[PDB]
């Protein structure tokens, strides 16, 4: 119904190469590295904030 935002893909270091949905996966390689690593560390850090 659209009350929640459509989920993005869940990237990892393995799914890194295979996700073309978001841009820059090749075009901006190290920025993309910062996006996937920042997103993984964001889910992990969100987990730690949940336990905390």
């Amino acid at each position: 119904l659209g009350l929640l935002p459509k989920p993005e893909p869940k990237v990892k270091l393995s799914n890194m190469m295979s996700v073309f949905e978001n841009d820059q996966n090749i075009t901006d390689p190290t920025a993309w590295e910062k996006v996937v690593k920042d997103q993984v560390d964001l889910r992990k850090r969100k987990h730690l904030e949940e336990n905390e």
Binding site: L1, G2, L3, K6
Partner: protein, 636 residues
């Protein structure tokens, strides 16, 4: 902003925000009645339905008789403007026309009404005839297809002209007597200045003030417009005395416009278009159950027919009968009488379903037919291009604008819907005469909604595009002989509309001078320099940099007379040659800059192909090129 959005609905395909209808006006005033008028003016409103003027009109009217001064009306244009103009006309007539002696003084006053479009000119003229018939006035059209000659202007009193033809009439040196005789200069839709025809209006305005100083009696100038910001700056452009300025917001509109957006969340065009069609269908389904007659605007004319086909198979899949459940016998009759007889763009079937369409590229007769049928109401849904909002007054309860990106040959790129067009599309709405309020709707991409909210609030100034038309206007003026030097040019440019706008916001319109030259002397003179270089290159005018002397050439005079653009002019200059032949003549004609906006079409292409085989005058270009299409149309 918060008051504007009251209520927001979230839907799977799209997020729709529903703006409530505007507020009703506070009454600090008396509604002015008709019996308060003098003897002759009581037939100004021969059908007096209310016997009282609308919220906008009364105050502006009595102010208009009270002062003789330059006036400006920023208004919803809810039919309120027509009567006001009529009444000022009657005043001028009374000033040159005695109350006791009922002989009308014909040769004294002259009147001009500047209506941007030929069709709207026509409509206006019938209105003026109806209202002014009792004095015995000739109200006739001076513009374009009107084809009035040297004499009839002299015979006539009230004139209704389009901006272009009025410009060209007043530019010509011999008629200047008529120009002096005109006391009353009415400018309808002064908001046109935003668009590139607006340059003509500001040039006309400049000519009225600056060009006639030898007789030097300045006519009454009345601007009439949709409500717009920077009204004050507009007055400083014209003369306007502070009291003549009347700013009225949309709260004074006859039918309050309920503003509605659907943001589209999709990106790729194949699903995006489908989502838009689904949204449109949903809106139509909500509307028609209420007995709502509806218009759907689109970008292109080819889009219209396919859209209507989509509504026919989809809408009919849902329910066939409800669109016509009433007078199906007479609907079958009238529908077959209209569609089957004159229509041949395979548009008959759409008419027959009872969802019709109107666009440039539909026959003149078929065109009038579609208008009339949608007026009667056998047409529940009307798919349209942008012609109707701009041209025709006929309102319809629900108005949907489908899409954002329009293709402009100006850029050669897909731009967003321009505010000045969006607004006039929203103007046609629930009918002021019959229905209570309108439904506006904009089918749009969500990212640009943030932009459309603001530009739809009408916070945007009338943009001055004088930069393109400066050169041609200056050339024409030199042909008039009014400018012998750069200083004269910039004095004329002080009465120019870009001048005011530069003063307001120098860096927006790219004034480098800024702090230097409060009057922008050196900026004005620099623009004149820039103009006279390119003009001199086109051998339009004579100019010298250090000595500064101006004179008009023959080519410049020709461009002034036939109102050729400067680009068209230099194109003619080089492309015409001593040895050029019959084949090349058509090619050059096609190259004329006025055809830059022309382009070949895929529905046109079969007839083009049939033509170019049997065409007597050969074409060096080929079917894909618009020039070839132009000159084969010329041959036809």
């Amino acid at each position: 902003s918060l008051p504007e959005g009251s209520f927001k609905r979230v839907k799977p395909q799209y997020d729709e925000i529903h703006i409530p209808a505007p507020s009703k006006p506070v009454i600090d005033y008396e509604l002015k009645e008709i019996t308060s008028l003098p003897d002759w003016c009581q037939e100004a409103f021969p059908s007096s339905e209310t016997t009282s003027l609308n919220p906008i009109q009364s105050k502006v009217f009595h102010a208009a008789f009270e002062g003789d001064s330059n006036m400006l009306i920023c208004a919803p244009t809810g039919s309120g403007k027509t009567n006001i103009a009529l009444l000022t006309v009657l005043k001028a007539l009374s000033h040159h026309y005695n109350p006791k002696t009922k002989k009308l003084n014909l040769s004294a006053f002259k009147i001009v009404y500047i209506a941007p479009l030929k069709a709207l000119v026509q409509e206006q003229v019938r209105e003026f005839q109806r209202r002014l018939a009792f004095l015995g006035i000739k109200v006739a059209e001076l513009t374009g297809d009107s084809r009035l000659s040297r004499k009839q202007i002299d015979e006539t009193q009230v004139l209704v002209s389009t901006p272009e033809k009025w410009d060209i009439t007043t530019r010509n040196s011999n008629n200047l007597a008529i120009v002096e005789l005109v006391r009353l200069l009415i400018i309808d839709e002064i908001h046109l200045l935003h668009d590139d025809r607006g340059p003509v209006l500001e040039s006309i305005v400049a000519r009225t003030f600056w060009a006639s100083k030898y007789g030097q009696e300045y006519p009454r100038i009345i601007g009439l417009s949709a409500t717009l910001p920077n009204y004050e700056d507009v007055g400083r452009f014209l003369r306007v005395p502070k009291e003549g300025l009347f700013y009225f917001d949309s709260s004074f509109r006859p039918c309050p416009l309920s503003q509605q957006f659907c943001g589209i969340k999709e990106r790729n065009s194949l699903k995006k278009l489908k989502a838009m069609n689904d949204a449109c269908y949903e809106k139509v389904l909500e509307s028609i159950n209420e007995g709502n007659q509806i218009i759907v605007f689109v970008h292109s004319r080819k889009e219209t027919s396919r859209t209507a086909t989509w509504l026919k198979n989809k809408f009919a899949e849902e329910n066939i009968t409800h669109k016509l459940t009433k007078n199906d016998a007479g609907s079958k009759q009238i529908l077959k009488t209209e569609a089957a007889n004159v229509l041949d763009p395979s548009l008959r079937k759409l008419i027959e379903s009872g969802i019709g369409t109107h666009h440039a590229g539909l026959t003149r007769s078929d065109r009038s037919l579609s208008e009339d049928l949608f007026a009667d109401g056998l047409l529940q849904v009307l798919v349209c291009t942008a012609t109707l909002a701009w041209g025709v007054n006929l309102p319809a309860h629900t108005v949907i604008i489908k899409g954002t990106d329009v293709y402009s040959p100006e850029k050669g790129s897909w731009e967003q819907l321009s505010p000045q067009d969006v607004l006039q599309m929203l103007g046609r709405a629930g009918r002021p005469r019959y229905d209570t309020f309108g439904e506006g709707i904009i089918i749009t991409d969500q990212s640009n909604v943030q932009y459309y909210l603001s530009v739809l609030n009408q916070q945007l100034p009338i943009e001055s595009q004088f930069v393109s038309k400066l050169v041609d206007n200056l050339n024409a003026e030199v042909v008039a002989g009014n400018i012998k030097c750069r200083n004269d040019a910039v004095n004329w440019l002080a009465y120019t509309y870009l001048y005011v706008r530069m003063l307001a916001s120098p860096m927006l319109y790219k004034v480098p001078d800024i702090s230097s030259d409060g009057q922008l002397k050196k900026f004005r003179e620099s623009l004149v320099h820039s103009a006279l270089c390119i003009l001199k290159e086109q051998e339009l005018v004579l100019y010298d940099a250090e000595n500064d002397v101006i004179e008009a050439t023959d080519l410049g005079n020709i461009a002034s007379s036939f109102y050729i653009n400067h680009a068209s002019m230099d194109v003619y200059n080089r492309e015409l040659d001593e040895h050029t032949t019959q084949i090349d003549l058509f090619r050059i004609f096609s190259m004329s800059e006025e055809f830059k906006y022309v382009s070949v079409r895929y529905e046109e292409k079969r007839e083009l192909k049939q033509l170019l085989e049997k065409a007597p005058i050969p074409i060096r270009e080929d079917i894909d090129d618009p020039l070839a299409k132009v000159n084969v149309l010329l041959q036809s």
